[PDB]
Write a protein that binds this ligand. Structure first.
Ligand SMILES: [Zn+2]
Lengths: 50, 118, 125, 49, 207, 71, 84, 58
RNA sequence: AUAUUGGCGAGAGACCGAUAGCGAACAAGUACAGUGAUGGAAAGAUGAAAAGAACUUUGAAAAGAGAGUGAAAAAGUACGUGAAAUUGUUGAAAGGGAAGGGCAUUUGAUCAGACA
RNA sequence: CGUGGAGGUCAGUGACGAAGCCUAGACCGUAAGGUCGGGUCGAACGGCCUCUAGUGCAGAUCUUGGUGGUAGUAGCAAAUAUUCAAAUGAGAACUUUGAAGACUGAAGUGGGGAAAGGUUCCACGUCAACAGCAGUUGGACGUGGGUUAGUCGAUCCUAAGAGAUGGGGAAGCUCCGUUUCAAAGGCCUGAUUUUAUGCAGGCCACCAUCGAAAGGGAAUCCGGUUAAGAUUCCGGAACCUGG
RNA sequence: AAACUUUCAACAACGGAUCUCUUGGUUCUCGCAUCGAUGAAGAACGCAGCGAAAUGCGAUACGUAAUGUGAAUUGCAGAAUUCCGUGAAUCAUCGAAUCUUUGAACGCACAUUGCGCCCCUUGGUAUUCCAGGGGGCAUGCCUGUUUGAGCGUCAU
């Protein structure tokens, strides 16, 4: 909520910095098997239960 | 860059000054990283700071060692960190103790060595 | 055949140990033989490959071509050779990822810590 | 059941016997261990039997 | 593994529905929820009568049967019809119970041993071996059995001085003592016949 | 933030989360040789900290920002 | 209604984050994590939760200190400057 | 003064905007290719309610 | 002497070979579900080497067509081969409220051996 | 007869193309099945004597995966209602602006907030997927910016209650109990700093701790300002507490 | 007669079986014995020139030191004969250090980034107020020391 706690604002910040796609220069490395970011998250679909 | 075997020849205050004249550099490069896309010179400065602090600390620890030589109790940080069990276990002397009866028996009737033939 | 107990005849373990080898073991897997003149001069058969070594190719579509090394890509287990390249469709050029076993060293990037290696291996100047 | 002219046969597998099973694959792998131990001891006590 | 197929927590739902009574996973949010389990028919399930370690791998045989067979397999080596019929190239051999000198027990080099065996006429049976090296067929060649050769002659010493190490490397050739003789060398594949090269010391100790 | 430097005499910094508006005052006093009358801190949503320091008049922030090298 | 209407009123938690396992198990009215009873010194581990032990036992983390012990034993729990 | 953009960072670190557009569209394609499978392999065992009451007696 | 499905290091198998074998050959106790205890997946292979399709042209663009690389795009990142269910185009044939099948032969197609 | 593997053997087939797959094309066998040609494909595979088994499917309201007829069908119909012109654009029933008609009708379709959610806020670019039609738009895609407090809240107090200590139980995980059957503690001087307290020096027997963003409570207002912040920033005028 | 329906084949599609492969598993055997109050296992947060993860690490933050080898890393940029050298490296080894907030978890407490006390030091006019820095403050038990209580008790 608005009147929240720092223990939760921390965990929301982490989720904000995690919510991005994959860097395209990872796909150019040699023995690469990562196509996309399979751990993505958005508020519509999956709630992080904290 | 900066190098340990050059820094060991330097003293406390010189290294303390080198730290500051490196941290200023790092603070400048952290500005240039904004107005530029990439600054790899920054890594050498971070590792330089670390190589400096390492030397400072090691000097200071050796000092306290030389202070605590012979004194029976020296700090836990300086004491050897073997495993808890091997610090709790018996000393080589404490374990090789014997009763007077047993050492008399050992000096009188030791395990002779021998062989089977005429 | 093998007669010890601490060495493996296991395909799985061996291939793992190849494809997860570090860059310090790969230096020796990426070794190459010397030409029949340097075999006679330095007195050895093979050495690990190094940048700025001149070289000749003996097996491949680019046989007979000579060059000198520009990069040992010891993640691809490969090696790249000057005067040995391929023009991409863009007009640009990309070098060839050779493998050292299909090469022959003609001139050597001599140095201290290689003269020593040659000396311990029973070689000469 | 009891079906034919067969012996009465007593077989003690009503407990969880499958846990308390020991197959001795170790027979030769540890015969050699015993031999090595004898051989080592015998050199520790080099002239003694 | 004894715990295969049983790491799942599952129970049947029962009669009352349009699906079977096989045990089914419970929960949601993944594909496994509702899937069948614990059966031999089921993906992820166990197998039928999981293979256990307390099976009879090694088999007992009577000592006199073993010796009967070893003597028969020795006696077959003197029969050229069986040797030829078994895959040995001995058409250009003078005498079949082949007895070479006991100086073969003192040879220390493969370069010399092979020459001796070429002289007494085994050259063809060594070529047979090193021309028969074909690749295995199936899922046994990523199980450390990639290659298949044919068998070669069997040199039968009595007192080894280097021959067993000299012929250690040549393909196909095996090496044995007159004691400690092996049916798995004399009759391979249960096929009687084997080209054996005896030394005179061995031949004399066989009595 | 590069508006608040000219509009007010305000500098905006990124500071460690373990800093408490006194440490910041003294750090600015030490590094940039100025005087400070007011600090307002907030915690950004990326887990960093932001500090709006307001310098006394008799200290213009553009001079300090050019002296630092970011205008 | 016991379903769709009575699932609107689910807006106040009963579990929060534990400091010991980091997950939403810390009950608030009784103050006891349901995965590793936090005020209690012993972590919950029952032999019937044999899968649950896999998820929280050793190996599942970094092993900051422990993973150098086998290295330091192989060498004799030794000390001092290396060599030349 | 703004001598940096994310496009410029990724240009410095290899990828051009053409490469970025194409590789992005492929990473979007694959996400949908997978979501297809998750919606495909789920419709079977998703309506398998544990306690449906069947509002029909008389 | 003995025990040892755990831990560290090793060697091997008439074992499984990606619906199998540990649940996991892959960023797997991961994603995800559930208040929680707990539950718990799927997913391997281009090619020797990206040489991953320069350039032209129609289109708003995706794309298409040529061109090109390649030993091979009947390998184009939806990529080893690429079955079947199911489907489209072409061709042959039949067909009054089913179709399919057995015995026998006509007609059409096709194969034959040629005793050459 | 057939299948996966094992031991022997044909000095077996094979990149001049192994296996696999397709073939109303052929031959053999009563049959299980085997063999051949062609097409495709690209790296290992068979015959004979024996061994061994996780060895042969039309079914089990079988398991997993995939796919169909149904079928371009049922249907996308609650909440009074949309229309014109222009702009942008490849493209406008649905975007934007203007003009018109209307509705919610102050217990609102408004303005704000608690829980809860987590950056959904704002801007630029953008439309493969999503918005069960469409889409140039969007709570979507991508990249970034953004939350400023001595006075608002937490923090402080206690409530219903929870819960250590001393103790007592209990095989034990731990239970009771919260002042109990405890030796449960600190505050000011002459000593005038030897700050020790010799005396001084008296004063109950109180005796953890958590527990409310709606209870109790120390103190602030106006005006202005931003793409998105404000009783928080700027200007001005004030107040409280502790020194 | 076409359309339509059905059967076969070719080509193309849906789909991903079969064949071949396999840095994985499982089973057997051999050897070894090495967690923690000198603060473990586990957790949260954070760190890279461009990384969301996995792996690694801790404000000395994909790492510092030392030792060894002896010229790389490589997706891009950026450095570079420093390369006959105290010396590259997502190297190996590893004996020196650092080791955020935690956690048996240790000042009290914790749905709080809450509230304290002691010592040294610095600043503000400052034994008393405020702030900063460093170092400390758990419990049970043992040995010993120090100060004590008790007509329990001895002598003078
Ligand atoms: Zn917990």
């Amino acid at each position: 909520a608005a009147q929240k706690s720092f223990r939760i604002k921390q965990k929301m910040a982490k989720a904000k910095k995690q919510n991005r796609p994959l860097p395209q220069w990872i796909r150019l490395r040699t023995n690469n098997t990562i196509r996309y970011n399979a751990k993505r998250r958005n508020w519509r679909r999956t709630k992080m239960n904290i | 860059g900066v190098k340990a075997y050059e820094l060991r020849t330097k003293s406390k205050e010189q290294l303390a000054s080198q730290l500051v004249d490196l941290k200023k550099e790092l603070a400048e490069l952290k500005v240039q990283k904004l107005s530029r896309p990439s600054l790899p010179k920054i890594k050498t400065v971070r590792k330089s700071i670390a190589c400096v602090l390492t030397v400072i600390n090691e000097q200071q620890r050796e000092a306290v060692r030389q202070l605590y030589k012979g004194k029976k109790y020296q700090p836990k940080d300086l004491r050897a960190k073997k495993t808890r069990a091997l610090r709790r276990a018996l000393t080589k002397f404490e374990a090789s103790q014997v009763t007077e009866k047993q050492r008399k028996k050992q000096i009188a009737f030791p395990q002779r060595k021998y062989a089977i033939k005429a | 055949a093998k007669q010890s107990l601490d060495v493996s005849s296991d395909r799985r373990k061996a291939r793992k140990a190849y494809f997860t080898a570090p860059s310090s073991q790969r230096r020796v897997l990426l070794s190459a033989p010397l030409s029949k003149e340097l075999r006679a001069q330095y007195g050895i058969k093979a050495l690990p490959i190094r940048r700025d070594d001149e070289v000749l190719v003996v097996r491949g579509s680019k046989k007979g071509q000579e060059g000198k090394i520009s990069s040992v890509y010891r993640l691809k287990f490969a090696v790249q050779v000057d005067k040995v390249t391929k023009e991409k469709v863009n007009g640009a050029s990309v070098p060839i990822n050779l493998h050292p076993s299909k090469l022959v060293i003609t001139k050597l990037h001599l140095d201290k810590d290689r003269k020593a290696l040659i000396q311990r291996k029973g070689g000469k100047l | 059941a009891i079906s034919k002219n067969l012996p009465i046969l007593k077989n003690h597998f009503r407990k969880h016997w499958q846990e308390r099973v020991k197959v001795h694959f170790d027979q030769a792998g540890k015969k050699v261990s015993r031999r090595n131990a004898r051989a080592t001891r015998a050199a520790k006590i080099a002239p003694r039997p | 593994s004894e715990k295969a197929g049983h790491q799942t927590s599952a129970e049947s739902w029962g009669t009352g529905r349009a699906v079977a009574r096989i045990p089914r996973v419970g929960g949601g949010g993944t594909g496994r929820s509702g899937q069948g389990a614990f059966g031999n028919m089921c993906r992820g399930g166990r197998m039928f009568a999981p293979t256990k370690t307390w099976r009879k791998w090694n088999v007992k045989v009577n000592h006199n049967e073993k010796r009967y067979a070893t003597a028969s397999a020795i006696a077959a080596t003197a029969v050229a019809s069986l040797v030829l019929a078994r895959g040995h190239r001995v058409e250009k051999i003078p005498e079949i119970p082949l007895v070479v000198s006991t100086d073969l027990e003192s040879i220390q080099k493969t370069k010399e041993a092979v020459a001796a065996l070429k002289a007494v006429g085994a050259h063809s049976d060594l070529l047979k071996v090193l021309k028969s090296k074909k690749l295995r067929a199936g899922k046994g060649k990523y199980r450390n059995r990639r290659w298949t050769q044919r068998r070669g002659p069997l040199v039968v010493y009595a007192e080894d001085n280097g021959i067993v190490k000299a012929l250690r490397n040549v393909p196909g050739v095996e090496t044995a003592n007159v004691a400690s003789l092996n049916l798995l060398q004399l009759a391979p594949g249960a096929h009687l016949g084997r080209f054996v090269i005896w030394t005179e010391a061995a031949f004399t100790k066989l009595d | 933030a590069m508006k608040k430097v000219e509009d007010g005499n305000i500098l905006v910094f990124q500071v460690s989360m373990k800093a408490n508006k006194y440490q910041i005052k003294k750090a600015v006093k030490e590094l940039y040789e100025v005087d400070v009358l007011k600090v307002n801190t907030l915690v950004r949503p990326n887990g960093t900290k932001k500090a709006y320091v307001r310098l006394t008049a008799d200290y213009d922030a553009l001079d300090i920002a050019n002296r630092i090298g970011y205008i | 209604g016991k379903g769709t209407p009575s699932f609107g009123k689910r807006h106040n938690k009963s579990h929060t984050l534990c400091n010991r396992c980091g997950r939403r198990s810390f009950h608030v009215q009784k103050k006891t994590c349901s995965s590793c009873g936090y005020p209690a010194a012993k972590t919950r581990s029952y032999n019937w939760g044999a899968k649950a032990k896999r998820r929280h036992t050793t190996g599942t983390g970094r092993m900051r200190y422990l993973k150098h012990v086998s290295r330091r034993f192989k060498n004799g729990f030794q000390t001092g400057s290396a060599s030349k | 003064r703004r001598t940096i953009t994310a496009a410029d960072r990724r240009m410095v670190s290899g990828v051009t905007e053409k490469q970025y557009k194409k590789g992005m569209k492929k990473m979007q394609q694959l996400e949908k290719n997978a979501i297809n499978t998750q919606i495909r392999r789920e419709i079977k065992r998703v309506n398998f309610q544990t306690h449906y009451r069947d509002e029909l007696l008389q």
